[PDB]
Amino acid sequence: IRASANLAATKMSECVLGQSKRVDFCGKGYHLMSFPQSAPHGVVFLHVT
Amino acid sequence: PVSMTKTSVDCTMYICGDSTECSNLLLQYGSFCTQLNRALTGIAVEQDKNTQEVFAQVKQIYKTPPIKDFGGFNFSQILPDPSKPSKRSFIEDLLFNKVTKFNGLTVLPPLLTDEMIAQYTSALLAGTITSGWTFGAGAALQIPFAMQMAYRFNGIGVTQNVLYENQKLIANQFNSAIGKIQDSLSSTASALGKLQDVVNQNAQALNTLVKQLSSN
Amino acid sequence: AYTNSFTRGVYYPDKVFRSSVLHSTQDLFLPFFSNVTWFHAIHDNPVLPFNDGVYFASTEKSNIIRGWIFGTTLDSKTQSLLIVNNATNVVIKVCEFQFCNDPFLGVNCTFEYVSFKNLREFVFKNIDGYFKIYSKHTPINLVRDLPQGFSALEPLVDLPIGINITRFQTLLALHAAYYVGYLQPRTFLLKYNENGTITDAVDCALDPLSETKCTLKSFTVEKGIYQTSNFRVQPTESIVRFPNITNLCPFGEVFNATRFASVYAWNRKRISNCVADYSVLYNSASFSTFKCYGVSPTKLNDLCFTNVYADSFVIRGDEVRQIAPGQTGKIADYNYKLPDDFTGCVIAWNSNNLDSKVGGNYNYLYRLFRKSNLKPFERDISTEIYQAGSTPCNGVEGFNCYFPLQSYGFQPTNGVGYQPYRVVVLSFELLHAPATVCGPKKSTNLVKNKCVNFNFNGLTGTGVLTESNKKFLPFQQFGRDIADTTDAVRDPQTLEILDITPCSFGGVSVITPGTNTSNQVAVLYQDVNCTEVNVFQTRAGCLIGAEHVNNSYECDIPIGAGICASYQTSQSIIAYTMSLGAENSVAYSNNSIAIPTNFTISVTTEILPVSMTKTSVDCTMYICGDSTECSNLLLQYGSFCTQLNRALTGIAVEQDKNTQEVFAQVKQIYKTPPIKDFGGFNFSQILPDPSKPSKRSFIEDLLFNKVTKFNGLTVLPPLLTDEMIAQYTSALLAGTITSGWTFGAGAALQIPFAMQMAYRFNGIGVTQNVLYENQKLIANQFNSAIGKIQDSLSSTASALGKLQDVVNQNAQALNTLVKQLSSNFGAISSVLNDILSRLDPPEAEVQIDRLITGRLQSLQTYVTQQLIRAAEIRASANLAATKMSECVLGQSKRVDFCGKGYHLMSFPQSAPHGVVFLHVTYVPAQEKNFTTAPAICHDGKAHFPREGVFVSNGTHWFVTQRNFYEPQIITTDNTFVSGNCDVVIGIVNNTVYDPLQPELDS
């Protein structure tokens, strides 16, 4: 969970809080941004690609 | 899956619930259950730390403007609804609705309740709607959402000119795409797989602990 | 009267010296900060009890005491202990001498030994059969109250008494106040310096400030919450709801019976609708053997049973162990089988005089032949002739034809080994059937909404009892949850349904500021009403101690549900709903743009633990240190030792591997030039100083100065020593500051630091011209930031927070491993040589089984803590390897990963079992406030910036990058032509300067 959560923190940092040039890191396709959504003990990302 | 139910068992209550003899016989093992309690409280604190690192990277309170003149990109489904009694998104409401003890082991309440976890998410959404990448680094710089998509287009090496040339078209595609998210997220239970399975996994872990209270 | 006792009432526990360490002792002590009595000594020496001992304190000017007395009549008629010290002839005897009513000094025996302005303390304790004397004198200069300070009484003649004396008398000064207190088994935390004199002590169960000190084992506290204890409101009384039936049960039918069955046709009498007391069975001395592993004999009255069957039969006195789970025998296999999971209690009283007669009690019968084993509790009335041979047996006995049901002969003339013995299985099966035989206890009235000790039909516990609307069927008795714990019950007196929810409980957490700041406390009772408890009630529960405030501040010490405290205004701890920052509404619009005119190059210190102590705990010398038999028994487990030692050597070689992966990422070692001229950038803080004895930095010297056994466990030295990790850190730091990023990739390519910082600005999206205009200002900013982090790392303990804590979990990891040398794991003592020199080989093998299984429970979970904590170390170490790779060996274009803000570079400094980075970052400071448009139209064409953003002050249209206000006119070397302006929305009409246009026109 903490590996996926540091993944989520870098994901939010580089995909929400910025734009990631890492191809296929923010879902399939050329990553544009992501939208956080709270969920019961989790985060749902709306990765626009 | 970013976080977990902060389960915390007691050396007294879970292992030897309300028993002086059994608590003494567990302290017969010395500090052994004490580092277990330390480890579980550590899991609680690092779970709080995960939630803090994913959400409270933000240093301020960002709130959405009263007008959603977002350049054609209606977010009232992804942004908190003022008509809702709890200021959460509509897709978050279907994430709260379609997807959703006292016997020696407790659950600690989160440092961040559900409504203000939703408040941090609203803060992150607001920062990445009106401020984009700038509030992650330093001071909050107000930037339009059209600019964020146009500059984000540059990031992947496609030129931003196409975006303003087909702004209405991609507004239609992105709004209908979020609508397809709404439809799939409301129709298929498999769309919540990676959280349903992990919440269930914690549920079976706790449930096996519960089943050991039947085990001889 | 009462007066303040700050630190008095304390004595030394033993003769053992402890050095610079904090240890907790429990004994008969006097509580601190307690109001103790103050008496006067004019115109008063009463008798006080001595049941717990005394702490005596006297003020004297002529030492007016001539005897401590312990007896009954104290007038030479009986044994009474006497103490007289006439300066050469110290006497401690207990014979009969005649003393006065008040012994005083003006300036059958059992032992013999010869040894305001004044304060003298005396303490007497009674354990384990000798004669103690405590004595300590000290000069004071105070007359009003108790002086402040800690003096620890040391027994001079230390020989622990053990006499039971509950009465003593005081000897007051009459040529002066005295302190007397009652002693309790309370534990304190007593502080030893290096030197042997106790300087301070905390009754750690006094206030939440001290309750922090119980769990932290220190005198200074950090601002934070601490799990201290487990609050659970104690139930006030005891409740029992047994069924109404109260008739006397025919236990005479099964004990005082005239007729007993035999083992072939033993009576299986259901005993129900009666009251089973068992107390007359305890008071009866008639039973000889009362054997059962299922239930206990004596603590049975409080239990109410499902249904009890009395299996009445007769078998021999040697056959009494045959009625047991798993016993195999002739009668046990041919007449009466006991299951392995048999619950119930078999009783065998002596039948020397009951089941016998002169001619022979010939009515007791038993099977001796069967071709199959018996089922438990079966009823075999088979009357066929057993076939011994192969011949068919037509009811004709003789050869190969014998009948199985054999009889006994019981006569009083027979021997006591053949004399009839009575064994009866009162089979107490606790099964599903409704409880009907309860103890002879009186019932109590029912209570709701208040947790109470309940004992419903034998099931004990605590919980609240509310009415329930469920339709329990008749014969339906309990509701069990998933844990098969009783969730609901039907009251057997009144046909109503009662939920059992166990009583309110939770941990005790403490809100406190630092001991250098305040002593005002806050105790938490969490997730409850303030009913079983300036009180604040939230979703987290009741917060006792801090003031509720509607104003919200930054959250400092969280207690739960985002209610948290802070110490402000006089000042006090204030609890509030936490603010999620400063309330910063953003003036969003479709044309609102904010661009920083000014920045600051802040350096954020992210500290990553990258190595650890290379521990190698060999199993033989740890679990079986200095023992041959323990190692011989340990090798019986086969491969656990070789696999755990492989795991630990893998840990060591992988710590070397990742410290190589975080430091020796370069094939070539560089050294700094003798002239440290780096374009105004003061690197003398981070480069190694030749004036130091070790070739290490000044920042590293801070990292080493304030920023910092032999029981079979050792540390392996790292391959990369302290000086070697220092020389890698200097080598890669020199590689950075002299070569940029290329030394991690290939051949080292020389670049000056101004060029390097220019391209590292270029790497985040800020153009290097800002650096090359303000190189002096940024030299001042970076050097002052280096000085600021120098001050921070030299003045704040949290600068080593996330590394020192990792060093800690390593330290109490090894320390708890050492605690398993003191924790017992079910053995008689945890000391190995104490076991091997005392304890026999047979149970020594099973306690070495306990030590191997449990020492490797602690140890294999220490090693999986090494491997999960080293998944943390390895995740942070591959993280730090990539931080070296694209921060030291490179530049990170990926945002908010290599430091707060836009990362430029990072400085590796060596740290004890870790690495610290100075992530030099670009953070904007203030912005001016502008309007924008998505594109600009000049001649019908739409223009878009290739790099930067169209910005405007309202009068002139500029293009600047996203992260610095660099006002430049719009240029076709920064914009292009794409599409037309009628389709874009938000475009405004402007004019475009070209870098072609004045060159064409002029």
Ligand SMILES: *[C@@H]1O[C@H](CO)[C@@H](O)[C@H](O)[C@H]1NC(C)=O
């Ligand atoms: C909000 O989104 C809905 C989609 O259901 C759309 O019909 C509506 O026009 C949008 N409103 C605005 C103001 O964009």
Ligand SMILES: *[C@@H]1O[C@H](CO)[C@@H](O)[C@H](O)[C@H]1NC(C)=O
């Ligand atoms: C302090 O002394 C007063 C004197 O009467 C007494 O009433 C009170 O109980 C004392 N406090 C404690 C905590 O013993």
Ligand SMILES: *[C@@H]1O[C@H](CO)[C@@H](O)[C@H](O)[C@H]1NC(C)=O
């Ligand atoms: C002083 O003490 C000794 C024994 O300690 C005793 O024999 C002697 O009588 C004492 N002297 C007086 C004056 O009581």
Ligand SMILES: *[C@@H]1O[C@H](CO)[C@@H](O)[C@H](O)[C@H]1NC(C)=O
């Ligand atoms: C400790 O003992 C030393 C002698 O070893 C003495 O000089 C000193 O005064 C003692 N106290 C302290 C506080 O060092």
Ligand SMILES: *[C@@H]1O[C@H](CO)[C@@H](O)[C@H](O)[C@H]1NC(C)=O
């Ligand atoms: C059974 O016999 C014993 C033997 O003295 C007697 O004490 C006891 O009261 C008897 N039980 C009855 C009469 O219920």
Ligand SMILES: *[C@@H]1O[C@H](CO)[C@@H](O)[C@H](O)[C@H]1NC(C)=O
């Ligand atoms: C029950 O009956 C079967 C067949 O009639 C027989 O094999 C078995 O031994 C019987 N068991 C008992 C306890 O009578």
Ligand SMILES: *[C@@H]1O[C@H](CO)[C@@H](O)[C@H](O)[C@H]1NC(C)=O
């Ligand atoms: C039996 O229990 C019920 C419970 O209310 C009560 O009415 C009745 O009095 C009880 N029987 C006796 C003999 O007390």
Ligand SMILES: *[C@@H]1O[C@H](CO)[C@@H](O)[C@H](O)[C@H]1NC(C)=O
């Ligand atoms: C707290 O107590 C009030 C009244 O005593 C009650 O209405 C409420 O339900 C209780 N809540 C909890 C969580 O115990």
Ligand SMILES: *[C@@H]1O[C@H](CO)[C@@H](O)[C@H](O)[C@H]1NC(C)=O
């Ligand atoms: C920016 O300019 C607008 C226009 O005058 C003004 O309303 C706003 O307060 C300014 N500042 C910020 C931070 O938006």
Ligand SMILES: *[C@@H]1O[C@H](CO)[C@@H](O)[C@H](O)[C@H]1NC(C)=O
């Ligand atoms: C930019 O910021 C620095 C430090 O924040 C400050 O000293 C300086 O005056 C500011 N302005 C310019 C033009 O450098």
Ligand SMILES: *[C@@H]1O[C@H](CO)[C@@H](O)[C@H](O)[C@H]1NC(C)=O
């Ligand atoms: C670097 O810092 C040191 C700090 O002691 C200072 O003395 C020195 O003047 C600074 N500059 C250079 C070029 O060494």
Ligand SMILES: *[C@@H]1O[C@H](CO)[C@@H](O)[C@H](O)[C@H]1NC(C)=O
């Ligand atoms: C921006 O939105 C405001 C209302 O919020 C509107 O008056 C204005 O015309 C809009 N401008 C553009 C360029 O969309």
